[PDB]
Amino acid sequence: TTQTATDFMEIVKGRRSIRNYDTNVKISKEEMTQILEEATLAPSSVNMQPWRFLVIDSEEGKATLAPLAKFNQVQVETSSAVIAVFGDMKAIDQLENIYDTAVEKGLMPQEVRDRQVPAIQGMYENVPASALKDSILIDSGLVSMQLMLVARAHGYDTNPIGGYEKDQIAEAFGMEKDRYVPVMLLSIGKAVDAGYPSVRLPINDIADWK
Amino acid sequence: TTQTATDFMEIVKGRRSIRNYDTNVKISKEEMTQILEEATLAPSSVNMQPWRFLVIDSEEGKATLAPLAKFNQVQVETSSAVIAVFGDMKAIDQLENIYDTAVEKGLMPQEVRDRQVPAIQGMYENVPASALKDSILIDSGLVSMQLMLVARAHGYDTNPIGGYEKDQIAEAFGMEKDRYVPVMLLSIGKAVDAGYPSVRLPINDIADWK
Ligand SMILES: Cc1cc2nc3c(=O)[nH]c(=O)nc-3n(C[C@H](O)[C@H](O)[C@H](O)COP(=O)(O)O)c2cc1C
Ligand SMILES: Cc1cc2nc3c(=O)[nH]c(=O)nc-3n(C[C@H](O)[C@H](O)[C@H](O)COP(=O)(O)O)c2cc1C
């Protein structure tokens, strides 16, 4: 249905927030899996990979989401899916699994893992929750950007969305409480129109050389 | 020699944290401005573009940065530059400038601008500082990811860095106090080695279909 793109600069420069999608185009399980695999290649602090996703694409899921998305119902209804991005406050719990996997795949020495897992755990035991949260938001921002661009590599488009009932969404989809920080929604689908161009500030307004 | 790339998947898949750079490669102010122009095409809440940058590339600047960077000295010393990323807590103050420019450049009808600006201003009037900061952290993540990928399009590489004296960097570089949230440092330069591959979690461990 969609055109694969490879040109980095067209993928980046041509990205806009697209609010209207083709309601007859759906993204397959395997293609969404690939898009997410490609997106999650992003970096994160100590490779903790705190990002978590709901791929809301079923009729019943769209129905549950719609009431929560405020003023953003066109994106929610017409989209192939809405990807709900969260940060996991328990992200450091995966460290042993991540570093164990690095060891198993030949990518990290055992001795290195033996030393850095307790070292990193130690550091994070003395980080306030507010600091950890700030770090998880930055990293979730990172993966969300790469996701938007990966979407366009696959011929899709997206709209990052903050206008939704963030405090209701976890419970609405059966997620455990007090764990998952809502980051954004991201609609994804085949664009049916070009969107609208927008301005950016001149660089001399926002950067200083030192 | 530094070599540009066009292929999106090679730019993304090939991105690692590079910690050692060619000390004889420097990035011109011209090329760095073009890199930042391309990175800042990133989206942000209400297009408020809250990100701000210090391009620390001078001998004096690098000497000023070094004592604040901890055990990330190899990156700071060898890199062509370190880009210090901040979020401006007064970002909304540029809203009218941003939207006025859209009208001037014919990208937005005045009608639309005259309705959207006051509505947006009203909305952010009832957003507390803590929620504004979260939003600015997310957007600063967004632009920082795009900056890493754009660097590789130009033949460079980066390392995102959180291990620095965040509380001290604004004052060290003469920035207005109590305004700019430190996001990260990002070393940039020509890679002199490939770095280390790293693992990512299985998608079905971090994503759920609904
Ligand atoms: C985190 C975030 C939240 C956003 N919230 C909404 C939203 O709720 N609804 C919407 O239509 N657009 C939303 N926007 C889209 C912005 O308005 C858009 O990125 C900005 O106007 C620049 O336009 P562009 O994406 O087409 O380049 C959001 C963008 C971001 C990054
Ligand atoms: C926000 C942020 C802060 C980071 N802090 C550091 C740092 O202080 N020093 C460092 O060497 N790497 C730092 N990293 C790099 C991570 O360790 C790295 O991204 C992760 O191990 C995955 O490896 P990769 O980027 O090569 O794919 C940071 C990454 C991010 C995104």
- First CA to last CA distance, chain A: 49
- The identity of residue B119, as a single letter, is A
| Spatial CB neighbours of A185, under 8 Å, sequence gap ≥ 6 | A69, A72, A76, A82, A83, A84, A85, A160, A161, A162, A164
Strand partners, A54: A84, B208
Give the nearest chain A residue to B210 (CA atoms): A56
Integer Cα distance of A10 and B39 in angstroms:
13
| Cβ burial, residue A89 (10 Å; 0-12/13-18/19+) | middle
Question: Best residue in A28, A116, A137, A152 to probe B by mutation, most B CBs within 10 Å?
Answer: A137
| CATH number of the domain residue B118 falls in | 3.40.109.10
The tokens of B123 are what? 């909305």
| Spatial CB neighbours of A111, under 8 Å, sequence gap ≥ 6 | none
Integer Cα distance of A186 and B132 in angstroms:
19
- Torsion region of A147: left, alpha or beta (phi above 0 gives left; psi -120 to 50 gives alpha): alpha
Which of A145, A116, A59, A207 has its CA nearest to residue B173?
A207
The tokens of A36 are what? 């997410």
Give the nearest chain A residue to B140 (CA atoms): A138
Backbone angles phi, psi at A4, to 5 degrees: -55, 130
How do the residues of chain A divide into helix, strand and coil, expressed in percent and rounded to 5?
50, 15, 35
Q: Helix crossing, B110-125 with B95-104: angle to 10°?
A: 170
A74 lines ligand 1 (CB under 6 A): no
Integer Cα distance of B195 and B210 in angstroms:
38
B47 lines ligand 1 (CB under 6 A): yes
Which of A47, A11, A69 has its CA nearest to residue A142?
A47
Measured CA angle at B84 (ends B78, B89), to 5 deg: 175
Integer Cα distance of B98 and B105 in angstroms:
11
- Tally of structural domains, chain B: 1
Q: Do B54 and A148 touch (CB under 8 A)?
A: no
Integer Cα distance of A88 and A45 in angstroms:
13
Q: Helix crossing, A29-39 with A129-153: angle to 10°?
A: 120
DSSP for residue B94: G
Give the CA dihedral B127, B132, B135, B136, nearest 10 degrees.
150
| H or E segment and range at residue B31 | helix B29-39
B198 lines ligand 2 (CB under 6 A): yes
CA distance readout (Å), B31 to A118, A170, B80, B171: 42, 44, 12, 27
**Domain around B194:** 1-210
B179 is in an annotated binding site: no
Give the CA dihedral B2, B6, B10, B14, nearest 10 degrees.
30
B28 is in an annotated binding site: no
Strand partners, B160: B186
| Spatial CB neighbours of A151, under 8 Å, sequence gap ≥ 6 | A35, A157, A158, A188
CA distance readout (Å), A192 to A19, A63, B26: 9, 22, 44
Strands A81-88 and A180-189: antiparallel
Determined by: X-ray
Integer Cα distance of B48 and B50 in angstroms:
6
The tokens of A16 are what? 């806009």
Which ligand sits nearest to residue B14's alpha carbon? 2
- B210 contact residues in A (CB cutoff 8 A): 54-58, 61, 64, 173
How do the residues of chain B divide into helix, strand and coil, expressed in percent and rounded to 5?
50, 15, 35
| Spatial CB neighbours of B168, under 8 Å, sequence gap ≥ 6 | B68
The answer to whether A89 touches A125, Cβ cutoff 8 Å, is: no
- The identity of residue B71, as a single letter, is F
CA distance readout (Å), B36 to A137, A188, B200: 22, 26, 28
What's the sign of the alpha-carbon dihedral A88, A90, A91, A93? negative
Strands A81-88 and A51-56: antiparallel
Token pair 């790339």 in the structure block, residue: B5
The tokens of A104 are what? 């198993």
The answer to whether A160 touches A148, Cβ cutoff 8 Å, is: yes
A81 lines ligand 2 (CB under 6 A): no
| Spatial CB neighbours of A122, under 8 Å, sequence gap ≥ 6 | none
| Spatial CB neighbours of B198, under 8 Å, sequence gap ≥ 6 | A47, A102, A107, B16
- Torsion region of B76: left, alpha or beta (phi above 0 gives left; psi -120 to 50 gives alpha): alpha
Interface of A with B in 171-200 (CB under 8 A): 173, 183-184, 196-200
- The identity of residue A78, as a single letter, is T
Q: Do B6 and A11 touch (CB under 8 A)?
A: no
The answer to whether B157 touches B72, Cβ cutoff 8 Å, is: no
Integer Cα distance of A50 and B94 in angstroms:
32
Strand partners, B7: A7
The tokens of B52 are what? 């701000």
The tokens of A25 are what? 């185009």
CA distance readout (Å), B165 to B70, B95, B195: 8, 31, 25
Integer Cα distance of A164 and A177 in angstroms:
18
Measured CA angle at B3 (ends B12, A149), to 5 deg: 25
